[PDB]
């Protein structure tokens, strides 16, 4: 399918460091660019992968990912395979000016995402990410993690569309079956 799965992430980035619980600053780096290499031109298979992925990212690294997706002409949100609605020139000061000058204009997000909806999903995700550097997150890269359950909770991420779902009414629910 060409979509990143939790297994792709484990095989393509994590394999060479199942020797130690504690990563070097350099190792975390390698791991980082390996994941972003995986998600820069392709998308997450599903919400479980995007959620799993949170262990490995800081808000800033996610920002970088959104920028490199956009560069490869892709919606900032890693689950989306569409392109942004409006193009922007990274070296253009006009384009940079527009994002902040224009007051409550769609340009600001439609230049990074396919829609406001995915802008929201991307930002809802991002602000939950830890500022702790990856190498400081001892063990979160280990396949058979002795603290798997603990890391699952410490780096829990709730997706925006998980909250939207959770509130739907019975009348809403019923429509889908028919
Ligand atoms: Zn999108």
UniProtKB/Swiss-Prot annotation:
Changing residue 75 to S: Loss of function. A zinc finger (RTR1-type) spans 52-138. Signal peptide: none annotated. It is an enzyme of class 3 (hydrolase). GO terms for biological process: transcription by RNA polymerase II. Zn(2+) binds at residues 75, 80, 114, 118. GO terms for cellular component: cytoplasm; nucleus. It catalyses: O-phospho-L-seryl-[protein] + H2O = L-seryl-[protein] + phosphate; O-phospho-L-threonyl-[protein] + H2O = L-threonyl-[protein] + phosphate. Keywords: Cytoplasm, Hydrolase, Metal-binding, Nucleus, Protein phosphatase, Transcription, Transcription regulation, Zinc, Zinc-finger. Interacts with RPO21. This is RNA polymerase II subunit B1 CTD phosphatase RTR1. It comes from Saccharomyces cerevisiae (strain ATCC 204508 / S288c). The gene is RTR1. The chain holds residues 1 to 176 of 226 of the full protein.
């Amino acid at each position: 399918s060409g979509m990143a799965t939790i297994e792709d992430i484990k095989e393509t980035a994590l394999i060479p460091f199942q020797k130690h619980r504690q990563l070097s600053m350099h190792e975390a780096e390698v791991i980082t660019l390996e994941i972003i290499g995986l998600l820069c031109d392709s998308e997450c298979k599903d919400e479980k992968t995007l959620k799993y992925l949170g262990r490995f990212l800081t808000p800033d690294m996610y920002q970088d990912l959104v920028d490199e997706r956009n560069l490869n002409k892709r919606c900032g949100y890693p689950l989306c395979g569409k392109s942004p609605e409006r193009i922007r020139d990274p070296f253009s000061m006009n384009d940079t000016t527009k994002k902040f000058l224009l007051e409550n204009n769609p340009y600001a997000y439609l230049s990074h995402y396919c829609s406001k909806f995915h802008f929201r999903c991307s930002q809802f995700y991002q602000v939950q990410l830890s500022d702790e550097a990856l190498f400081a997150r001892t063990g979160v890269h280990l396949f058979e993690d002795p603290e798997q359950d603990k890391h699952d909770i410490d780096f829990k991420v709730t997706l925006f569309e998980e909250l939207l779902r959770e509130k739907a009414s019975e009348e809403d629910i019923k429509s889908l079956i028919s």
